[PDB]
Structure formats: structure tokens, C-alpha cells
Amino acid sequence: ADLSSRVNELHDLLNQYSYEYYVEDNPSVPDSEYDKLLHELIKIEEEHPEYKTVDSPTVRVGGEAQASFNKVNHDTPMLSLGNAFNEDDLRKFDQRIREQIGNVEYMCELKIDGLAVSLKYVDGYFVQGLTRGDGTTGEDITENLKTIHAIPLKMKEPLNVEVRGEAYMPRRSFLRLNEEKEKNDEQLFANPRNAAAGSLRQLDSKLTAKRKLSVFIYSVNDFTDFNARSQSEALDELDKLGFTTNKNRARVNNIDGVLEYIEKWTSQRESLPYDIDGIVIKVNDLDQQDEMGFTQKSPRWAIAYKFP
Amino acid sequence: ADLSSRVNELHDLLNQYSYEYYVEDNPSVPDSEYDKLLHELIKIEEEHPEYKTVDSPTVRVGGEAQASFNKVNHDTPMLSLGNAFNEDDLRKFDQRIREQIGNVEYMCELKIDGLAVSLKYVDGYFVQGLTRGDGTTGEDITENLKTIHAIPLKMKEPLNVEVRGEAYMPRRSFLRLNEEKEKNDEQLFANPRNAAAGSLRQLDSKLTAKRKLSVFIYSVNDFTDFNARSQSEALDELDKLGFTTNKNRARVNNIDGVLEYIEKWTSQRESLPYDIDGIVIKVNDLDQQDEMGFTQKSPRWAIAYKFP
């Protein structure tokens, strides 16, 4: 009955293996080992329920409680970005920045074709996950989001923050899912985004759990507790805090670097294990972002290039 | 929506006031202030449920989850004590200790006429409370025990330990309860112990919460993480760890001291706000207890004197 040693061991191992599988994408042990340890913890929690915890690896299998889908206001409204469609657009963007605050470093990142989500952490624990909604108000899908291994149940520091991310289904998992749908003459999902939408906006988290979803975190509502002085530093810091970020981001020195990054990802996007619908470009320096401010709708320091 | 500051403030205040009321028995603020803050936190948790936590002051109100009453084995079986009925009995106990290990210090304590319970802490959180049962196997009444303010939801150090206590209803609260029963067509409880048993065997934790219960903690299953060298030092340490212990305990030098402690409490027992059915006497020193060991039934190092 005092099983503390084994429970804490199992927590440590399953947490390490999940991170290796789902974040690093670099496994140390085969599935058979993960599954064995997971079934053991599950058995322990069934027979000794006093060992259940909010951040237990068993949270990932989903369970009884259903997503409320209640309307909930974000702590901080999510941004709405202006779009760019060609080099001309990006050069205008660049010139307006260079005329106001001078020559700036940019960060470039892939625009994941996913479902935007806000993930609120209180005392470092994942306590609420909302769809973006209208940007001010979203739907509570917390119980479903909890089953995504790429979302940490506890971060490395006990912060009170709302992180923003893109939830998605990997391309191949989508294709395999569709193969199963056809096998069972069900209607196939249109694309990975629709499949991930369907998977998140349903009532049984155990069904979400069986679907293959991940996330990339791209920002946070409040930088107060961050050492970061730039967007790129913020993403590195999110990495250190335990979050899953996109490794294909790049700092560039000028608009020629931004154009180069877009040209690269025009050709390379095909090979990615997820769909992207564009490239987001941001003035890197956080203070300089503040200097540029917002229009009535959108940051003046960011633009979303859209692939045709 | 980021209500972290007010929530932590409310936890801090309500935890302080609860302890002052129910543990120190020395309030600093009137009920009106406690109730006002509690009602505020409840409203916050209703409208912002992401702020609910396992150790929230709101736990004390009770909830929807019911005690399972499942049969559960204790981590460590609870002791069964031999009895003494007079001075001769206590002298024989004393003589057999001093013939085998020499002259020892004793701890004397009041034997609370309550319901014996084991309270299991994992990582310092109260996770399971069982009735004593047969000493090996008890009934799970965790949800009900959670509503007793004198049981800490979180201890001051993250230990994995099973503490042992006596749960009871104060005499005056028993009397007032009985007065209420004599308003409806309702049968009165026989005595405080019976009232407390009835209160803890409810299916509705919200009813248990409305009853006035308390606890005294008297021991632990495992002293491994305790710096205590004696029973009295262990009780002091439980105090510092955040538990509710009985302050009427005394260290005495010999059997003459034990007899005087019993004579004192024969007279003073009537003035106590709870019922006692005896006095427990223990070899104080933990190593010496280990030295005396056990018969097939009972520690050789302890005895329960029983009032007639």
C-alpha cells in the first residue's frame, strides 16, 4: 500500500518517454516498454486510487469527464494578423516599419494550418484549454486537449500564463485515419485540419486520445515572467519551460532574408509532416513590437504571408 | 480572468482563519469576515472553475462526490492496546518494562472516545482517510473526512505517511445537535461518539460538513522522515507539520507521575469539550519501544487505562 516509490518512478519514466516520443521525436525505448509501464500505472491507479494526480501520465488516455464546450473569455484576447500575398506586400510591411523605428530583426515562422487554441496555466499546471473562437471568447475543450502529449500537464516553473498554440493532426495520421474511414465506409475528412477539428470538437476525450494530435506553441499572453527580450528568445524560453515549439523558425536581418525564408518554404513545405498555409513574420524585439503598436484590428509589427 | 492574485490571497486568508478557528481555537477575525471571503472564493470557483484545486478552502463545504465506503487495507495495520483498570495493573505494566529495559520516561495522553481513523498523505496531500475497521482493513470515508477543518488538506512537508487520529464531535455540538433533533419527529443520538459515527457514515459530504467535527492526531505509521526521538517529540513534529494534536499530553519520569496524571484527569475530564474513555501511557523513547516489541496482540510498551 505505500507505493510512492514505484508511482514516482513510473511517473518519471512515462514522462520522459512521452517527451522523447512526442516532443523530441527521438524515442529511447520501444512502444512495448512505454505500453507496459503505462498499463502498470493504470492498474496501480485502479487498485490504489489515492495515487491518482492531475498530472498523471494516465490523463493522456482520456476518461470520464467531458469537455463542457462552454463559452469562456480568454484572459487576453488573441491577435488578428494582416495578410500578405506577394513580395510587394512584404516590402510595404518592411518599409512602414523601417520608416518608423529603423532597421529591425525579424523572426520568421511557419503558419501551421491547425486549430488555434489558448492554454492557460495556473501555478504551472494546465487548467484550461479554449479554441480561439472570435478571439475574445472561445469554447472550453480542456478535457480533450489534455490527451495531446505535446501539451505539458505541468510546466518547469509555476507560472500563471496563457500560452497560444496551433493544434493539428500530422498529415500521415490523417491519411491513415481516412484509410480506416473508407474501410468502414464512413465519410472521409476533407483535410488534416478538419480531422483535428472533428477530433477536438466531440464529447468523449477517450476518442480524442486515440486520434493522433500534436501542437506548436507560438506565443504567450503576458511576458512579465519571461527573461526573453525577443520573440525568438521567448520561443527558446517556452522550450525550456517544457512546451512544444516549431524548430523551423528563423531570425533574419532584413526583408531579403524574409523573402529567402518564404522561397525556401515554398519548395520545402511539401516534405513537412504537417500542413502550413503560410509564413508569419514578426518584428523580433518585444520592445520594438510595443513601439509599433496596433491598428484598430491588427499588430503593426506582424504579418501573415499566405501561400496561394 | 487572470485572477491568480486574488485566488492566492483568498487561499492564504481562509487557510489562516480556518487554522485559528479550528486548530488554535483563537480567532483573529469574526465569522462574518470568514464567511464573506469563503463566499467570494466559491463564486470565483463557480465562474472561473480553472481556479479549483484539491486543497482549496472550498473543499470544506463538501461536494457531489460520495465516500465509496470501499474496504481498503491500511498501509500499516493499526495497533491494538492492552487495558489497565487500576493502579495494580499500571504498576505491573511499569514493573515489566523496568525489569527488561531499565527506568524509562513515559508519555501520557487522553484517550479520545472517538472514531479511530488512518489519514494517508502522499506528496504531503491528504489523499485517503479510512476508519480503523479491524485494524488491517477499514472503510473509505475520504470525502467526508475532507470536510473536517482540523485535518490539513496539505501538510508543511511533502511526506508519504499514514497518520492516525481520533475523529470526534465536541460535547456541546452534540448537545445542540440533539436539541435540533428534538424539533422534528427525530430520534436523538446516544452520545457524541454515536453522533460523529452517524455524521461520517453519511453518503452526502455536504451533511458531514454541516456537522461540527474535529480530530486529534496521535501517531504515524512510519517515523523514517521524522527527526523525533520520542513519542512526545513526534507529536510536537506533527504540530509543526500542520496537524491537530492534543495539548493535554505530558511526559512523566515514572509510574508515580503516570498515576498523578490519571488522578488529575479523573477530576478534570468533566471540564473537557470532548469525551475521553481513558488515558494512554507509552514508553516515550522510540528505540526503547522497539526494544520492548510486541506480543502476538499488542505493544508491550503501551497500555490504555480505562475509566470505570
SS3 sequence, A203-233? CCHHHHHHCCCEEEEEEECCCCCCCCCEHHH
User: Known binder of ligand: residue A305?
Assistant: no
Q: Between the CA of residue A29 and those of A23, A33, A148, what are the distances in Å?
A: 15, 6, 20
Cβ within 8 Å, pair B122-A54: no
Helix (H, G, I), strand (E, B) or coil at B163: strand
For residues B82 and B44, give the distance between their C-alpha atoms in angstroms, rounded to a whole number.
51
B188 & B236 share domain: yes
For residues A49 and A195, give the distance between their C-alpha atoms in angstroms, rounded to a whole number.
34
For residues B160 and A5, give the distance between their C-alpha atoms in angstroms, rounded to a whole number.
10
Considering the domain boundaries, does residue A71 fall inside one? no
Q: Å from B122 to nearest chain A CA?
A: 7
For residues B79 and A163, give the distance between their C-alpha atoms in angstroms, rounded to a whole number.
52
The cell for B150 is: 482540523
Q: Å from B95 to nearest chain A CA?
A: 37
For residues A40 and A74, give the distance between their C-alpha atoms in angstroms, rounded to a whole number.
38
Query: How many of the other CB atoms lie within 10 Å of CB of A196?
Result: 30
Of A54, A123, A160, the CB nearest to B2: A160
Burial of A103 (0-12, 13-18, 19+ CB in 10 A): exposed
CATH of the domain at A2: 1.10.287.610
Chain A residue numbers touching B1 (CB-CB < 8 A): 73-75
Chain B residue numbers touching A137 (CB-CB < 8 A): none
The strand pairing partners of A109, in sequence order, are A280
CB A225 within 8 A of CB A137: no
Kind and range of the H or E run holding B110: strand B106-112
CB B165 within 8 A of CB B119: yes
The strand pairing partners of B165, in sequence order, are B117, B217
Of A1, A76, A127, the CB nearest to B75: A1
Considering the domain boundaries, does residue A67 fall inside one? no
B221 & B254 share domain: no
The angstrom resolution of this structure is 1.8
Strand-pair category, B250-252 with B106-112: antiparallel
Chain A residue numbers touching B4 (CB-CB < 8 A): 122-123, 160
Kind and range of the H or E run holding B93: helix B87-100
Name the one residue in this structure whose C-alpha cell is 506480543.
B295
CATH of the domain at A220: 3.30.470.30
CA atoms within 13 A on the CB side of A302: 23
For residues B215 and B200, give the distance between their C-alpha atoms in angstroms, rounded to a whole number.
12
For residues B249 and B106, give the distance between their C-alpha atoms in angstroms, rounded to a whole number.
11
CA dihedral A87, A92, A93, A99 (to 10 degrees): 140
Q: Å from B50 to nearest chain A CA?
A: 5
B192 & B88 share domain: no
Residue type, B89: D
Which residues of B are the active-site residues?
111
**Minimum Cα–Cα distance from A7: chain B residue:** B122
CB B261 within 8 A of CB B207: no
Angle in degrees, 0-180, between the axes of helices B192-200 and B171-181, rounded to the nearest 10: 70
Cβ within 8 Å, pair B74-A1: yes
Of B1, B73, B142, the CB nearest to A1: B73
Helices and strands counted in chain B (H then E): 10, 11
A211 & A292 share domain: no
User: Known binder of ligand: residue A33?
Assistant: yes
For residues A231 and A248, give the distance between their C-alpha atoms in angstroms, rounded to a whole number.
14
Cβ within 8 Å, pair A73-B122: no
Considering the domain boundaries, does residue A66 fall inside one? no
CATH of the domain at B277: 3.30.1490.70
**Largest Cα–Cα distance of chain A, in whole Å?**
69
Cβ within 8 Å, pair A160-B4: yes
B140 & B193 share domain: yes
For residues A24 and A8, give the distance between their C-alpha atoms in angstroms, rounded to a whole number.
22
For residues B117 and B126, give the distance between their C-alpha atoms in angstroms, rounded to a whole number.
13
Alpha-carbon torsion B2, B6, B12, B14, what sign?
Answer: negative
Residue type, A109: E
Of the candidates B249, B144, B166, which has an alpha carbon nearest to the alpha carbon of residue B215?
B166
Chain B residue numbers touching A1 (CB-CB < 8 A): 73-75
Strand-pair category, B137-139 with B71-73: antiparallel
Last residue of a domain, one of B191, B210, B244: B244
The cell for B104 is: 524509562
Query: Which residues are within 8 A (CB) of A288 and not within 5 positions of it... i.e. 6 or more apart?
Result: A101, A104, A301
Cβ within 8 Å, pair B122-A4: yes
User: Known binder of ligand: residue A14?
Assistant: no
Considering the domain boundaries, does residue B73 fall inside one? no
Cβ within 8 Å, pair B75-A160: no
**Largest Cα–Cα distance of chain B, in whole Å?**
69
CB B182 within 8 A of CB B176: no
CA dihedral A274, A16, A202, A306 (to 10 degrees): -20
Instruction: Please note each residue after which chain B is broken, C-to-N distance over 2.5 A, or write none.
Output: none
Query: How many of the other CB atoms lie within 10 Å of CB of B203?
Result: 12
For residues B32 and B209, give the distance between their C-alpha atoms in angstroms, rounded to a whole number.
18
Instruction: Please state how this structure was obtained.
Output: X-ray
Considering the domain boundaries, does residue B70 fall inside one? no
Which residues of A are the active-site residues?
111
For residues B163 and A69, give the distance between their C-alpha atoms in angstroms, rounded to a whole number.
41
For residues A154 and A123, give the distance between their C-alpha atoms in angstroms, rounded to a whole number.
9
Considering the domain boundaries, does residue B265 fall inside one? yes
Considering the domain boundaries, does residue B229 fall inside one? yes
Number of domains in chain A: 3
Q: What are phi and psi of B262, to 5 degrees?
A: -60, -45
For residues B58 and B7, give the distance between their C-alpha atoms in angstroms, rounded to a whole number.
12
Strand-pair category, A302-306 with A82-84: parallel
User: Known binder of ligand: residue A35?
Assistant: yes
Chain A residue numbers touching B222 (CB-CB < 8 A): 2
Of the candidates A217, A256, A209, which has an alpha carbon nearest to the alpha carbon of residue A235?
A217
A36 & A16 share domain: yes
Q: Å from B127 to nearest chain A CA?
A: 5
Alpha-carbon torsion B240, B244, B245, B246, what sign?
Answer: positive
What secondary structure, in 3-state letters, does chain A show?
CCCHHHHHHHHHHHHHHHHHHHCCCCCCCCHHHHHHHHHHHHHHHHHCHHHCCCCCHHHHHCCCCCCCCCEEECCCCCCCCEEECCHHHHHHHHHHHHHHCCCCCEEEEEEECCEEEEEEEECCEEEEEEECCCCCEEEECHHHHCCCCCCCCECCCCCCEEEEEEEECCHHHHHHHHHHHHHCCCCCCCCHHHHHHHHHCCCCHHHHHHCCCEEEEEEECCCCCCCCCEHHHHHHHHHHHCCCCCCCCEEECCHHHHHHHHHHHHHHHHHCCCCEEEEEEEECEHHHHHHHCECCCCECCEEEEECC
Query: Which residues are within 8 A (CB) of B96 and not within 5 positions of it... i.e. 6 or more apart?
Result: B300
Cβ within 8 Å, pair A2-B50: no
Residues of B with CB under 8 A from a CB of A: 1-2, 4, 7, 50-51, 54, 73-76, 120, 122-123, 127-128, 142, 160, 162, 222
B304 & B186 share domain: no
Considering the domain boundaries, does residue B215 fall inside one? yes
The cell for B244 is: 491537530
Q: Å from B196 to nearest chain A CA?
A: 24
Q: Å from B236 to nearest chain A CA?
A: 24
Helix (H, G, I), strand (E, B) or coil at B257: helix
Last residue of a domain, one of B213, B244, B275: B244
Name the one residue in this structure whose C-alpha cell is 492526531.
B217
Chain A residue numbers touching B54 (CB-CB < 8 A): 54
Residue type, A39: H
CA atoms within 13 A on the CB side of A94: 20
Burial of A194 (0-12, 13-18, 19+ CB in 10 A): middle
Cβ within 8 Å, pair A73-B1: yes
A138 & A184 share domain: yes
The strand pairing partners of A278, in sequence order, are A111, A306
Cβ within 8 Å, pair A2-B128: no
Helix (H, G, I), strand (E, B) or coil at B84: strand
Chain A residue numbers touching B120 (CB-CB < 8 A): 50
Of the candidates B106, B121, B117, which has an alpha carbon nearest to the alpha carbon of residue B78?
B117
CA atoms within 13 A on the CB side of B239: 12
Q: Which residues of B are annotated as a binding site?
A: 31-35, 80-81, 109, 132, 166, 282, 306
Cβ within 8 Å, pair B160-A2: yes
For residues B82 and A18, give the distance between their C-alpha atoms in angstroms, rounded to a whole number.
53
A127 & A220 share domain: yes
Chain B residue numbers touching A54 (CB-CB < 8 A): 54
User: Known binder of ligand: residue A182?
Assistant: no
A255 & A234 share domain: no
**Minimum Cα–Cα distance from A162: chain B residue:** B2
The strand pairing partners of A252, in sequence order, are A106
Strands of the B125-131 sheet, one edge to the other: B125-131, B115-122, B161-168, B214-220
The cell for A136 is: 475574445
User: Known binder of ligand: residue A34?
Assistant: yes
Buried-state track B55-86, b at ≥16 Cβ within 10 A, e below 16? ebbbbbebeeeebeeeebebbbebeebeebee
Cβ within 8 Å, pair B4-A120: no
Query: Which residues are within 8 A (CB) of A9 and not within 5 positions of it... i.e. 6 or more apart?
Result: none
B208 & B127 share domain: yes
For residues B213 and B208, give the distance between their C-alpha atoms in angstroms, rounded to a whole number.
8
Q: Which domain holds residue B259?
A: 80-113+245-308
A302 & A184 share domain: no
